Amino acid sequence: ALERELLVATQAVRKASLLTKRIQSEVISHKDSTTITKNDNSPVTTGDYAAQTIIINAIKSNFPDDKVVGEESSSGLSDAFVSGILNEIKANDEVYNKNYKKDDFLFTNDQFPLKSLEDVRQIIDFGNYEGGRKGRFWCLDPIDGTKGFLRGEQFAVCLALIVDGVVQLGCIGCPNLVLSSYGAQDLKGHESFGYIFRAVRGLGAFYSPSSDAESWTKIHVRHLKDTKDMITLEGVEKGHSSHDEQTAIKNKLNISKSLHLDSQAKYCLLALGLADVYLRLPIKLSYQEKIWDHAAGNVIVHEAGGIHTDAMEDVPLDFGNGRTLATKGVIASSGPRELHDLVVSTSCDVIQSR
């Protein structure tokens, strides 16, 4: 099941992970020209578009009819901005093909040659699918954690395949993730562009240095019993999650130790067994989480033996509702069920007491 799809996912994430790692400092330096404020006031950069371009072009070259829910859109981008996207893709190709080329794998072809500005626009815009309850589609956040990217910190490149509303396959590139920062040992080859994490439903979760992506090491959550010894994972950005209510949960459960970082790299650390509980409570209850912020993590966490629900009702997340999740917030943990249920019911109670 889904062998070709996993190869495509992995290689697409891999090449985009190299590009985003390499361009990060330049994007930061040239923020006035490389960064755009979208209509929700969130940032998008040359790197986000370049990653979306590489990944969707790779999907379409290998699966021409496939549907994609991608975060970004080319509408309104100027030709100059698009030429910059294309140039970064070709600069990356020159490094990538020297060093990391995968035999018998195509990123582009006759139909999708990725040569012109119009090609770039077209490819970005294949991410305009609405998702939903039936059928197969890909789900992409080309740079998850753009704010973290722009702070020179953690971010992730995130791709998933959903079939009939269920995430079947996930692949997360964490180009800046150094495991020695999180207690753990790094693997040979990590230094160039971080790690890739991946999973297929029913087949396990694995990781590899991005530069490798051939030798895969199986991962599983850890199981601490002394909750007081547990570590939470939370976002850094104050406006992405209710950090004060999250702290309330922590106080109440005596879970003092804290890691903060942007992106679905958090799910990767949970799945690797370096932390225990991920908390993302909504500040505003009208907010609907985007599926691309959670899909890849969902299957990776599942396959690593963890639990993934909303933050109030303790129900599994439903990836067949369209581009958004209908529930409120997200909580993931190592389990077991009783611990997970405690965390979620504490979250519910904190939110109800507002």
| 130 binding Zn ion? (CB under 5 A) | yes
Give me the residue label for tokens 């080329």: 101
Compose the 151-180 pattern: x for residues touching Zn ion by CB under 5 A, - for all others: ------------------------------
| 310 binding Zn ion? (CB under 5 A) | no
Give me the residue label for tokens 């890849």: 296
| 119 binding Zn ion? (CB under 5 A) | no
Specify the DSSP element, H or E, that contains 144.
Answer: strand 136-144
Q: Is 138 left (phi over 0), alpha (psi -120 to 50) or beta?
A: beta
Least distance from Zn ion to the Cβ atom of residue 189, Å: 8
Closer residue to Zn ion in complex, CB, 7/342 = 342
Q: Which stretch binds Zn ion (CB under 5 A): 11-19, 51-59, 118-126, 285-293?
A: 285-293
Q: Is 208 annotated among the ligand-binding residues?
A: no
Least distance from Zn ion to the Cβ atom of residue 169, Å: 18
| 341 binding Zn ion? (CB under 5 A) | yes
Phi, psi of 209 (to 5 degrees): -55, 140
* C-alpha pair distances (Å), 253 with each of 107, 241, 267, 308: 48, 19, 21, 19
Among 71, 93, 289, 303, binds Zn ion (CB under 5 A): 71
Least distance from Zn ion to the Cβ atom of residue 250, Å: 7
The order of strands in the sheet holding 257-260 is 257-260, 231-234, 277-280, 330-333, 307-309
Contacts of 106 (CB under 8 A, 6+ apart): 58, 61, 62
| 93 binding Zn ion? (CB under 5 A) | no
Among 234, 276, 289, 303, binds Zn ion (CB under 5 A): 234
Catalytic residues: 48, 146
Closer residue to Zn ion in complex, CB, 106/336 = 336
Report the alpha-carbon distance of residue 113 to residue 155 in Å, rounded: 28
Interface with Zn ion in residues 38-67 (CB under 5 A): 42
Angle, CA of 245, 248 and 253, to the nearest 5°: 135
> What residue ranges bind Zn ion (CB under 5 A)?
26, 42, 71, 130, 141, 143-144, 146, 186, 191, 234, 258, 293, 305, 314, 341
